[PDB]
Amino acid sequence: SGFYDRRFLKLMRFYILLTGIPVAIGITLVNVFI
Amino acid sequence: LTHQQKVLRLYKRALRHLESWCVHRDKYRYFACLMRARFDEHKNEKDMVKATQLLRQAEEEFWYGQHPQPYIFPESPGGTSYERYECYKVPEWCLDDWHPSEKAMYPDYFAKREQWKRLRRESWEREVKQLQEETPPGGPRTEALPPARKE
Amino acid sequence: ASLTLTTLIILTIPIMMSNSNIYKTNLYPNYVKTTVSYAFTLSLVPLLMFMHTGQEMIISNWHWMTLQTVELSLSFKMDYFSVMFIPVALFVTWSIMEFSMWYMHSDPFINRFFKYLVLFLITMMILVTANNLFQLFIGWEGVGIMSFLLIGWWHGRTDANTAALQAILYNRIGDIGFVLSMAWFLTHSNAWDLQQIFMLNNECPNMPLIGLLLAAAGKSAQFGLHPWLPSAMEGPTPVSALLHSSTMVVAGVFLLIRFYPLMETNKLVQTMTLCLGAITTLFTALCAITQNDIKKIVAFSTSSQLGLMMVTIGINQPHLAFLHICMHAFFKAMLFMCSGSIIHSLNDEQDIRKMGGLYKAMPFTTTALIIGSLALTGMPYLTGFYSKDLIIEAVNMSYTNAWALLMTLIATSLTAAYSTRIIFFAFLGKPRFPPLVLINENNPLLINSIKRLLIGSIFAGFIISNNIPPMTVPNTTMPLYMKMTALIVTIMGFMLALELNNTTYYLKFKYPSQTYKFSNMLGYYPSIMHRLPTYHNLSMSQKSASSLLDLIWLETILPKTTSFIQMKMSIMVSNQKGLIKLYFLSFLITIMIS
Amino acid sequence: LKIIIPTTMLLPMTWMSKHNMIWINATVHSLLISLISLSLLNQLGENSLNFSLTFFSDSLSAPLLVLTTWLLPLMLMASQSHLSKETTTRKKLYITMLILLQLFLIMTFTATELILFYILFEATLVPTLIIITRWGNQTERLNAGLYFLFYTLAGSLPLLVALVYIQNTTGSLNFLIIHYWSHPLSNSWSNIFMWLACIMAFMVKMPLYGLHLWLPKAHVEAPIAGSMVLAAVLLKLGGYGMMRITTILNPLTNYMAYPFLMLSMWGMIMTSSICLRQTDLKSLIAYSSVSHMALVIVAIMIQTPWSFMGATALMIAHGLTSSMLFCLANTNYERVHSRTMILARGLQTLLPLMATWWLMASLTNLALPPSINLIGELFIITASFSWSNITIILMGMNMMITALYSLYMLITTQRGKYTHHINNIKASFTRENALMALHILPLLLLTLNPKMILGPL
Amino acid sequence: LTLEAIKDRVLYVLKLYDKIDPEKLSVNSHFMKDLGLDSLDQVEIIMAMEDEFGFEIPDIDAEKLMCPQEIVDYIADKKDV
Amino acid sequence: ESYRQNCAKELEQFTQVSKAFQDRYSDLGAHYSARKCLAKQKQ
């Protein structure tokens, strides 16, 4: 069964990106302006 | 082991290395026929005590000529692919673990499968009693015949 | 500047896409072949800006860790070598992509396989491009471990695993030398950079060059280190084609190529390099004369080519030495892929002796294998010529040890030898593969692949020999047999090998001579250098180290000692008894003493 | 003093936590306090950071401190399925050992008085003993407890008396001033015994080749939460202290290094060689650990600044990778109870992602670029090579065998056929993957920014 | 591959062997009690027959052999048709 | 491809600089300290 692994990756990717987006975008906005 | 099967395996063996040398189907055919001709032309019948000596001769005569590497079919222990696919042959009990969201996707196969597993768990005590029955204290032989069910 | 870095970096992206659902799709790999395609298309451009005006560049976009004095930083030098080499790798690897889509088309996990391909190639790019020596080390070692992941692809059978472990082992033995050199430049030159090191080392370096030489011996499979390369054929064919043909193993000498001027500082380096590269050409080629695998033969061939180009370095002509690689890749990839076509066609039977005589059964593969064999042979205006002839000729007219030159001669003979062996048994005979014939050359992508490599295989020698600036400065005078020798030795090769091979066709059973058993036992070398030292060590690591040295003495010497002495003392002081007269009288005498 | 209070504060929280929720409490807050620990990392490029009169934070300590704070949640994630059937009061008692332990670590890294540093250095011994002895499996653990114990004390006790001595022969025992007021001690015979007295304890706690015997026999026994600490940290702290006390000594070190450089330079190749033929995995890892610590200890003794840089880096990297291999082995041991490596066989066939972690972990065990393990190791080979041109011939052999057995543990317990009858395996929990992802990700990010891990020099 | 293909190709090889007289050959036709071929030729027929497939015959299984149906059964097992 | 030119010029100043810097800060060892650089300078 490959379910448990893919689930794990779904979770992990989802969180690292969950917090991942606000941070990256924040860094970019800080780059272009201030 | 016994003498007859012994000399036989020596024959198939030597014959195969002999192909490994002769390469061409032609030459190989010729020397093959010459070879079997040697085994019969020699002592196709004889007393044993001489015969074993004839083997001890033959083993040497072979071992000298055995060729650094025989041709080997891939399935065979030499093999260019003796276990190429052992990466894949997953034992069945492992599927019995997929959990329902996967198990739902093959209703048919799983159905048939519980049919089987049922057949086994139902069957087992009979193989117990039979194995218990046919066996003496427990000799060299492995397995025993079916008699009314399962085996 | 933007160009080269793009011709690297885009390769990274599919791996990134590896976590994306497209990776899980059947659809993934063709995005990879297309990816390398665009990568190549982009890759040509720097070479042309490099052409007519000839400019070269180094960039070091970002320092990574600023130590005292030393400040290592990633730095992509883009000299002649690094610029010229990239399109080659992209080209052949792209062909390997297209090939592999068919070779594996049945196989599960194929997507993972391609992931490992790109993952390998990118490390190779790390090695060819890197200026800063440490970065060369990451490219080095990383290529090594990719070799490990791919050799073990059919991880089920043990032999694959032993092959993989074997390869990592000999590479590591080379890596010792690499580290020795890598330290010594820092301790002395204080550097790890080709600018620094080239600048400060006008003086003779008596020792770093030899350890670095050993490292060069590592990947390149010199004589002391050859066997892993033949055993590396055990991985599935497109892999062995990928890098054991070219993209990996050539890097081992590529390293030595990068550091020519320092070599030029010494005499003993050029010396010993030649001293060994020659004998590995010979000793490998001899085993190459008499094998039965397609791939083993092609493997011994590739290593022999490597020894040849190794003396090409050792003869103090680095430029041609590099030149030979760029030609060599096409040849070898041709051979392994056509061989892959044969092998897949027949349900995979590597052994020639029951390989059929199928000259007509697969005519296109036939053509391919023919131009390939002629190219490796060194035919006068075909691509292999522009390397090989210039090489061995330059060896002739150079001052040098001669016996090695002799070895180059027998070797270049044997090239023609095994190259005719494989032709003979592969095609000419009345076929003798087992009956049924599933044979099917057809499947267009394969065709296109072999096509492109043929194209390069015939034009590239001329085109590239023409376009490159004349760093060689040609030697073209005395005498006439000078140039003839390269041909006549080949001709002797075909005549002897072929008349011999036909003489094999005339009944009369014979039994092997000792030379046969020798050269066909790969020189006995694996069967003695593997069954022996490993035994003395694995025994020693239990007969001694694991056991008596550290489980039985090292514990006896201070736990068991004290632990025993307290047994004795404790049973002695606490003597259980307690009769008064005893210790009471002891109070007496202890007073008398006190 | 800010990071240290909450670490104490989890204890009331643990005891007062609802009986079936405690793991979440301890986990979450341990993670938070890790993040607070991370702010310490800043240090300074010149002066060592200072705080109270009684603490300070040298760059040498900070990455270690961050690590030590980081490990607690990990040990929790590993433990919290290993035990379940245990009574609530006993479990609640159990995590207290762990946290109490790290509390002693956060105290003993920031030091500052070397007597305070000592008394905590030895205070660590108790909770780890309790854990090895009460929650280890199989009989031998009892005996193991003793080996773990006396080898520390027999080393530590003379060090103790020596410390007291110095603060009498000089002014204060404090580290800063002794760093400044430092004056050479030289030959004679009293000074030599001073030397060994101030070295042997530190060279016991990070195992030395002639003395390492307790360490494997600890790791064979301890429940994994004990293993992760006993490997990843305590060794490293012994190294930290030995790097501390070398502010004194000199020039005598130049004269006394040799014997220990022989036990180390030879013991590395030796133990690695023993490492090449173990019966069971859980030991194999341990000997790999000694085989790497020898590098640290020569790196300290040649005392060249490159060698201390490499010392720091290798200490941390080996910390994480060793702990990783241990949890990663315990998983198998729970799935099949084999312990012996031979029974696992074709584990890759039956499940993939663990094979991936085996790959990453072993891969960084052998150390290939640009793992902080590797870069940590290459420096000390550099400085060693400066110290003696011959020395490379030894180091190279290490880099040979550490390849082999490492790959070996991979290819023997994975690649190959599944054993047939072993039906016990059950397809990988989320916490498992979560755990080892937690080991390995920091280890890889960390390569991007070495400059914050190389330490004071 | 299919069972008929196996039985057919097998007999199709047994037919070509000289010592067998093709009309007497039958799938169930016995090998010693019927037909005098003897083991020294039995080894020939078996190796030559496996050679047609490229398949490999283990020796102890080669000892049984005899009835061609037993053979087609055997390849049927090993190829799992 | 030339060098052994202006590069010799920089090579010289580097020779002087690295010489003196080698002198000021060599075998100090770890725990380098000003008191020690002094102790060397008097030597």
Automatic annotation (TrEMBL), chain A:
Family of the protein in this entry: Belongs to the complex I NDUFB5 subunit family.
Record's protein name: NADH dehydrogenase [ubiquinone] 1 beta subcomplex subunit 5, mitochondrial
Function: Accessory subunit of the mitochondrial membrane respiratory chain NADH dehydrogenase (Complex I), that is believed not to be involved in catalysis. Complex I functions in the transfer of electrons from NADH to the respiratory chain. The immediate electron acceptor for the enzyme is believed to be ubiquinone.
Endpoints of the signal sequence: none
Location of the protein in the cell: Mitochondrion inner membrane
Organism phylogeny: Eukaryota, Metazoa, Chordata, Craniata, Vertebrata
Assembly information from the UniProt record: Complex I is composed of 45 different subunits.
Transmembrane intervals: 14-34
Organism: Sus scrofa (Pig)
From TrEMBL, chain B:
Shown part of the complete sequence: 52 to 202 of 221
Region named Disordered: 127-151
Subcellular location: Mitochondrion inner membrane
Subunit structure: Mammalian complex I is composed of 45 different subunits.
Function: Accessory subunit of the mitochondrial membrane respiratory chain NADH dehydrogenase (Complex I), that is believed to be not involved in catalysis. Complex I functions in the transfer of electrons from NADH to the respiratory chain. The immediate electron acceptor for the enzyme is believed to be ubiquinone.
Family of the protein in this entry: Belongs to the complex I LYR family.
Alphabetic keyword roster: Acetylation, Electron transport, Membrane, Mitochondrion, Mitochondrion inner membrane, Phosphoprotein, Respiratory chain, Transport
Membrane topology: Peripheral membrane protein
An annotated GO BP: mitochondrial electron transport, NADH to ubiquinone
Domain of life: Eukaryota
Protein name (database record): NADH dehydrogenase [ubiquinone] 1 beta subcomplex subunit 9
Native species: Sus scrofa (Pig)
A single GO cellular-component term on record: respiratory chain complex I
Complex 1 LYR protein domain: residues covered: 5-63
From TrEMBL, chain F:
UniProt-annotated location(s): Mitochondrion inner membrane
Domain of life of the source: Eukaryota
Function: Accessory subunit that is involved in the functional assembly of the mitochondrial respiratory chain complex I. Complex I has an NADH dehydrogenase activity with ubiquinone as an immediate electron acceptor and mediates the transfer of electrons from NADH to the respiratory chain.
Family affiliation: Belongs to the complex I NDUFB10 subunit family.
Protein name according to UniProt: NADH dehydrogenase [ubiquinone] 1 beta subcomplex subunit 10
Annotated source species: Sus scrofa
Residues of the full protein shown: 144 to 186 of 201
